[PDB]
Amino acid sequence: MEHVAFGSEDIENTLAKMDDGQLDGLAFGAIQLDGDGNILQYNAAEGDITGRDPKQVIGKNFFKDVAPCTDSPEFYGKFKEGVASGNLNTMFEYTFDYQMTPTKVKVHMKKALSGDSYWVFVKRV
Ligand SMILES: *C(=O)/C=C/c1ccc(O)cc1
């Protein structure tokens, strides 16, 4: 395992050192998005939660293509305000229900330490 707790205050500094292989050792799902919502990184734990194959969703748009259930003011709306503002740090519960059994999760969205990238972290509840 990589030992990093979900919700940790300095998580963006810790994850700045990991490559795709290290990200697969986290105890929670991790997605890195660009400012348009395209998927740059997608770890093994996220694929275990949602059924998606990580290598197949990299490059797709999360809000348009992969996760239309998140295209709502409650999820995408928060993301886009964060990108526009250049700051984002929010945690909320959500249900993922597209082409899968409805699954309740906790989501943490946080701006990355690098400029135009954003993390989405997911764990079951
Ligand atoms: C709603 O459409 C949610 C879909 C979804 C969430 C998270 C993922 O990693 C993949 C699909």
Q: How was this structure determined?
A: X-ray
Number of domains composing the chain: 1
Closest CA to 63 of 31, 104, 100, 91: 31
What Å resolution does this PDB entry report? 1.6
3-state secondary structure of 22: helix
Looking at the chain, list the stretches that DSSP marks H as alpha helix, in order from N- to C-terminal side: 11-15, 20-23, 44-50, 54-57, 76-85
- Mutate which of 49, 69, 104 for ligand 1? The one with the most ligand atoms within 8 Å of its CB, which is 69
C-alpha neighbours within 13 Å on the C-beta side of residue 56: 6
CATH at 79: 3.30.450.20
Question: Would you state the torsion angle of the CA atoms of residues 65, 68, 71, 72, taken in this order, to the nearest 10 degrees?
Answer: 170
Ligand 1 pocket: which of 43, 50, 56, 97 to mutate (most atoms within 8 A of CB): 50
Beta strands in the chain (DSSP E): 29-34, 39-42, 89-96, 103-111, 117-124
Give the nearest ligand 1 atom to 29 CA: 9
Range of the domain at 7: 1-125
